Design a protein around this nucleic acid. Structure first.
Lengths: 129, 83, 83, 149, 185
RNA sequence: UUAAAGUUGCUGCAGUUAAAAAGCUCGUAGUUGGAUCUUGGGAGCGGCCGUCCCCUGCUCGGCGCCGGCCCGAAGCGUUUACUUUGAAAAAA
RNA sequence: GAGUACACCGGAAUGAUUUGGGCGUGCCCCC
């Protein structure tokens, strides 16, 4: 059955980005999906996303643009520290110039750069470049 | 393309597609670069300017490039909005 | 259509699709109020009734249960209501 | 799909987004409560009660005009049955299959479906033990089964 | 007189004038049999952006189903008794803080912030109900709620949407826009 | 014996035909489990934004003023993991 | 008062008078 909604959301975004589509439809909504898309859209990888509100579970339609390469998840949520982050961005990212790891943190859903200069770490969510 | 001094170092900036915003390679022969002529406002002749659209080879291989060209012409203002 | 708008589609596609696969799901049924031509009462019944009902006063049967919509008896008029 | 069948069906209700009592509904919440009380004293499950109300009274849902569910209404009155209706229906199907199976010894599909039915009974029974609806000393048994309606 | 404050303290002057006007209404009209115990909690006026203002009236939560039956006449009466002011009725609901572990009965979810805001939104627009909500995130990261309204009964509320957005910004603090789309009816 | 071995694969292998999906199904222990509960601003600095303070309760008593006010404190506050700091942690 | 068309009215609109119905609130009966 359905076990991870963020994984299916990112796989749908990746598939419709590879197909060249302009809009998607994520079927279940959650706070972590909205925060993850907010991290992408603040960092400039997607457009405005509309949350279609209903009384069961919302649907998200993001204005896709030709700006994304891949989105993925790391299941299960592996906990990381400040001394373990370097290995993750070494074996997970293409270069040391771009690309981000989004990780769950007690300060909030936030990427690895502000996790570095806020001096805090937590559980990992995924990556995009 | 830049460094700490900020000077440019790349060999050439590659063309991007106007439909999917994907990089057109140097060996993608199926990619095109379409020129569309404008018209005079009253007399209705060729004034001289160009309108340029670039479609990568993946869209033409998909076969869904005329919809993209029609959308870009509607966005520029060539095709009438009601259509 | 690689650039089909899913936020505001035409209502013909919304009526075209399944009752669960729209943007917001809406049931295909409705409430109707069939009345007898020999009686003077008005009774509100369901479109997909799937039971047999009697009129107020125990005179006639209004609908018959089928696989889908209820089979209203002949001569009895009805109209859709809403709010 | 199903838990005991290879088919993956899709057929259920689709509740509307609109959250309001309709203006053509001239039934007070006490009135639909009274119809619920008299139809439950007629000896009906909450499913058939909801069907009869939406079929011959025009109410869409009880909990949208009263703010409370049907079984919660019957529990607040004090006339809801001790054994719930779905476990009762599953036990009735099990004892009917067993009554068929005792005469026909060669029927193996009846034996397989009986195995599936007692599996569903055991799963629902341990869930009802978890939510404390059933006492923990309650247990399904063959000779007890004909003692249970 | 008619106004009941939940605290034992002095009422203000604007809500006193509103209470005096409505008691003179129920004495001098045909509503005295339907406005006996019907009290008013409080009232407040704001500055709607433009060239006008509006009045927010607070109502206790058992008194919503009574005032919803006579909502149509009261807004007309407060329109004809005032000059050019639109008036809305908003229930007073309490919001409890989140039970953090740094800080007892379990908090009901009807008192949560989202439930209170949704109840305020559905109670602000009484003659036209909610038939769809859309949330848009602009490039700076802020939200923008877009609310769809039904087609039937729009000849009274086609011009009150600016006051609705003003009072929703003043009470809650979220952007809101109101539309009348063409999908179902 | 180690790397080469992505030929023991947690990072990181394979199962149609090359080695390899139990004949099929039920099932306890094990593993994995849908959405939802507090949002937003003010005081200021550089020119809306990367820093700055704020949105758990009562009995003993000290930066002070003339029984009235702020501060401290013997006493306790729904529990876990995760995360950051601090102690101690023999040498070679 | 069963009410499909109905028969008596009470409120009420401008000292005095009065505007066909039903409940399916919008199309159905009689002109």
């Amino acid at each position: 059955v359905r076990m991870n909604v963020l994984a299916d959301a990112l796989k749908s975004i990746n598939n419709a980005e590879k197909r060249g589509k302009r809009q998607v439809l994520i079927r279940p909504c959650s706070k972590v999906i909205v925060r993850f898309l907010t991290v992408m859209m603040k960092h400039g990888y997607i457009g405005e996303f509309e949350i279609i509100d209903d009384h069961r579970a919302g649907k998200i339609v993001v204005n896709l643009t030709g700006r994304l390469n891949k989105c993925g998840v790391i299941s299960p949520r592996f906990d990381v520290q400040l001394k373990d982050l370097e290995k993750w961005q070494n074996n997970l990212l293409p270069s040391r110039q771009f690309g981000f790891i989004v990780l769950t943190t007690s300060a909030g859903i936030m990427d690895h750069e502000e996790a570095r200069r806020k001096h805090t770490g937590g559980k990992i969510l995924g990556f995009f470049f | 393309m830049q460094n700490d001094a900020g000077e440019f170092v790349d060999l050439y900036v590659p063309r991007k597609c106007s439909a999917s915003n994907r990089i057109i390679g140097a060996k993608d022969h199926a990619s095109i670069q379409m020129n569309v002529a404008e018209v005079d406002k009253v007399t209705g002749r060729f004034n001289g300017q160009f309108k340029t659209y670039a479609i990568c080879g993946a869209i033409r291989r998909m076969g869904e490039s005329d919809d993209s060209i029609l959308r870009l012409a509607k966005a520029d203002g060539i095709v009438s909005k009601n259509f | 259509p690689l650039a089909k708008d899913l936020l505001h589609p035409s209502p013909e596609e919304e009526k075209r699709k399944h009752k669960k696969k729209r943007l917001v799901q809406s049931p295909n049924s409705y409430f109707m109020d069939v009345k007898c031509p020999g009686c003077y009462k008005i009774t509100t019944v369901f479109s997909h009734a799937q039971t047999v009902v009697l009129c107020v006063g125990c005179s006639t049967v209004l609908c018959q249960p089928t696989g889908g919509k209820a089979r209203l008896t002949e001569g009895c008029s009805f109209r859709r209501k809403q709010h | 799909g199903r838990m005991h069948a290879p088919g993956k069906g899709l057929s259920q209700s689709a509740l509307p987004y609109r959250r309001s009592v309709p203006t053509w509904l001239k039934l007070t919440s006490d009135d639909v409560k009274e119809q619920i009380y008299k139809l439950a004293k007629k000896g009906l499950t909450p499913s058939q009660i909801g069907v009869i109300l939406r079929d011959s009274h025009g109410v869409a849902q009880v909990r949208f005009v009263t703010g409370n569910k049907i079984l919660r209404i019957l529990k607040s009155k004090g006339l809801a049955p001790d054994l719930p209706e779905d476990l009762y229906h599953l036990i009735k199907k099990a004892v009917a299959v067993r009554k068929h199976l005792e005469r026909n010894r060669k029927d193996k599909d009846a034996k397989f479906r009986l195995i599936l039915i007692e599996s569903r009974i055991h799963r629902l029974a341990r869930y009802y033990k978890t939510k404390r609806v059933l006492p923990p000393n309650w247990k399904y048994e063959s000779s007890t089964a004909s003692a249970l309606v | 007189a008619k106004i009941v404050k939940p605290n034992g303290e002095k009422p203000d002057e604007f809500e006193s004038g509103i209470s005096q006007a409505l008691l003179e209404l129920e004495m001098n009209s045909d509503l005295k049999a339907q406005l006996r115990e019907l009290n008013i909690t409080a009232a407040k006026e704001i500055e709607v952006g433009g060239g006008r203002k509006a009045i927010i009236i607070f109502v206790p939560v058992p008194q919503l189903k009574s005032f919803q039956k006579i909502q149509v006449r009261l807004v007309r009466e407060l329109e004809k008794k005032f000059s050019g002011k639109h008036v809305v009725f908003i229930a007073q609901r309490r919001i409890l803080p989140k039970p953090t572990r740094k800080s007892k009965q379990k908090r009901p979810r009807s008192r949560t912030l989202t439930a209170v805001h949704d109840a305020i939104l559905e109670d602000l627009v009484f003659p036209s109900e909610i038939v769809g909500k859309r949330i848009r995130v602009k490039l700076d990261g802020s939200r923008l709620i877009k609310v769809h309204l039904d087609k039937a009964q729009q000849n009274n509320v086609e011009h009150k949407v600016e006051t609705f957005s003003g009072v929703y910004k003043k009470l809650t603090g979220k952007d809101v826009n109101f539309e009348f789309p063409e999908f179902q009816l």
